[PDB]
């Protein structure tokens, strides 16, 4: 039943002809965001094509840049390296930058309990759903949101916040639609 549902959504979006992130009338990523915002009760959502993009967004969004430090007690080997590459140090005395939740087919059904938390920045890694690398950042912090978008090339340049280095962490609508579908099937509105 999964193979059909996946195929159906890919067919629908392909039929629509709207498969670019930056294209007008793209409503798959916005749809994904809205669901996650409603589930988490967060005001702002930013989609990425990589967990790295969500991580960098949360860090740079709180001005945790080259030369700064944060708490890396809850980071895995990969995130440790990413922080080192960004030029960010460790301190046990400082707060954590985010709470990361790796989402998969086991725990996707129970997303309410996971996302309803006091964490001011929630990072969701959807990569293990098998639709391709994807991550979403959730916050009530407007400044984090705005900085997270501006770090993406074509993020809030669809037309205060001056951008430095930028990456292409824009998510494929097709990938976004698959995740949106998966969420809708597994209980979430």
């Amino acid at each position: 039943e999964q193979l059909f549902q996946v195929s159906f959504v890919l067919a629908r979006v392909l039929t629509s002809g709207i498969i670019m992130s930056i294209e007008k009338n793209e409503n798959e990523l916005k749809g994904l965001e809205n669901i996650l915002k409603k589930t988490s009760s967060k005001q702002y959502a930013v989609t990425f094509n990589s967990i790295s993009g969500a991580v960098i967004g949360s860090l740079w969004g709180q001005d945790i840049v080259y030369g700064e430090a944060t708490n890396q007690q809850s980071l895995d080997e990969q995130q440790e390296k990413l922080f080192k590459w960004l030029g960010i140090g460790h301190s046990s005395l400082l707060p954590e930058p985010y709470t990361l939740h790796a989402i998969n087919w086991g725990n996707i059904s129970n997303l309410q309990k996971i996302t309803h938390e006091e964490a001011h920045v929630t990072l969701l890694d959807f990569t293990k759903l098998g639709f391709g690398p994807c991550a979403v950042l959730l916050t009530n912090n407007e400044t984090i949101y705005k900085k997270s978008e501006r770090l993406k090339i074509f993020g809030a340049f669809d037309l205060e916040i001056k951008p430095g280095l930028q990456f292409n962490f824009r998510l494929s609508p097709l990938v976004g639609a698959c995740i949106k579908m998966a969420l809708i099937k597994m209980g979430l509105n």
Partner: protein, 428 residues
């Protein structure tokens, strides 16, 4: 059912519309409103079926399958699939041995992502001017760029036109520099019968859905000549902790698209070549210049305006460009600008913040760029218009002929072009 399918066929336009009143002055437009949409990419049954095939296989295999398929066609020794063109360029630079602090020569005119790949590699972009006809990195203005820090030259095959590899390759071997191509527009473009992406020590290439060879959304690929480069780029991913992996969904679309690429390319070539030939007869317009050994992919079609015509005496070039843009757009040809400002003067390269505290930039001699440094690139921005989707899409004969009528129609109203341009208010 929600579909992009166009229901109205493009009628064969009357050749007599060259004598018609301009659409900006209440005349009949060459292209009616209904015929102004184009489909891109070309999504066929094959692409839907390919999703149903690929979904059954492991995602990493689908990505591997694509990488190999496209690699063999391009003729690159080694390749890494990635989530974006920006990431491919980053991996290309690092793979070719670009270390933190190194300087990289780049054209002032290109997409931001070219330079943001250099900065991502912790290197410093050294912006250079372009040839006024090819619009690519000018090899003449390159002596004055070299320092002890300079590690690599990064030419852009902009629009799809292969850059002056022969000249830039000589400069690289002379100064023991590495050559890194940006082939994000040059899908299927060739020089001496060799595809762009094989010339440099490494190269990056966007495979986004707005490129001549599109994948299913965001995607890219990095090519490397030697295995030592390929291994270093792989080793960087291990050390950096960056996840630059491609989506199978995106790759799947590439697999099916590649089977039909040559077909689309052929229409693209014949359409563009015809338009060049026809614009050669016009007094006002001129299509892109192409070296003999080069083959243009025509991702974008940049048209030169003769701003030095007598009718345009005391009119600044930007007003002519703006007027022509409004005139053409009213006729139905959506001519536009690709880059509004040169990368040096984009905010990222004004604030020079980088990773933070200006990390890459403070690791070398600070450069305050000024407009007078890039006269050729600025002349282009003032005196050219671009067609993007309208010639990236392999349009039918009726549509291509509609374009030809439009330019020939406007070419018969050079006086009115001048009158309209002069009525435009001044700006900063």
């Amino acid at each position: 059912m929600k579909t992009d399918f166009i229901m109205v066929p493009t009628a064969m336009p009357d050749e007599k519309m060259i004598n018609y009143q301009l659409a900006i002055d209440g005349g009949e437009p060459v292209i009616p409103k209904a015929n102004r949409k184009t489909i891109f990419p070309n999504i066929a049954k094959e692409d839907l079926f390919q999703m149903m095939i690929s979904v059954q296989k492991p995602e990493e295999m689908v990505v591997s399958e694509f990488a190999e398929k496209y690699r063999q066609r391009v003729g690159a020794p080694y390749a890494i699939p990635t989530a974006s063109g920006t990431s491919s360029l980053h991996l290309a630079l690092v793979g070719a041995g670009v270390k933190a602090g190194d300087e990289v020569i780049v054209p002032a005119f290109t997409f931001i992502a070219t330079a943001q790949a250099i900065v991502a590699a912790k290197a410093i972009p050294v912006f250079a001017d372009i040839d006024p006809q090819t619009y690519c990195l000018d090899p003449r203005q390159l002596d004055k760029k070299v320092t002890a820090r300079t590690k690599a030259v990064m030419p852009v095959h902009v629009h799809g036109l292969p850059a002056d590899i022969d000249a830039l390759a000589s400069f690289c071997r002379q100064h023991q520099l590495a050559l890194i191509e940006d082939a994000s527009h040059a899908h299927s473009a060739t020089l001496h019968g060799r595809y762009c992406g094989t010339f440099g020590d490494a190269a990056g290439q966007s495979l986004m859905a707005d490129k001549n060879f599109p994948l299913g959304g965001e995607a890219g690929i990095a090519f490397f000549k030697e295995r030592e480069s390929y291994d270093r780029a792989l080793a960087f991913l291990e050390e950096s902790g960056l996840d630059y992996r491609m989506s199978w969904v995106a790759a799947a679309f590439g697999i099916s698209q590649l089977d039909r690429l040559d077909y689309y390319d052929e229409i693209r070539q014949r359409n563009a070549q015809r338009l060049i030939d026809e614009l050669a007869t016009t007094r006002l317009f001129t299509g892109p210049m192409i070296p003999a050994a080069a083959k243009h992919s025509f991702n974008m079609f940049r048209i030169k305006i003769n701003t030095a015509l007598p009718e345009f005496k005391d009119i600044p070039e930007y007003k002519l460009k703006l007027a022509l843009q409004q005139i053409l757009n009213e006729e139905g040809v959506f001519a536009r600008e690709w880059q509004n400002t040169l990368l040096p003067f984009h905010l990222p390269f004004q604030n020079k913040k980088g990773f933070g505290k200006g990390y890459p930039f403070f690791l070398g001699d600070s450069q305050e760029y000024k407009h007078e440094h890039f006269p050729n690139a600025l002349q282009m921005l003032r005196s050219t218009l671009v067609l993007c989707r309208e010639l990236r899409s392999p349009v039918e004969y009726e549509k291509l002929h509609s374009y030809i009528i439009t330019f020939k129609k406007v070419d018969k109203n050079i006086q009115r072009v001048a009158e309209i341009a002069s009525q435009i208010d001044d700006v900063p």
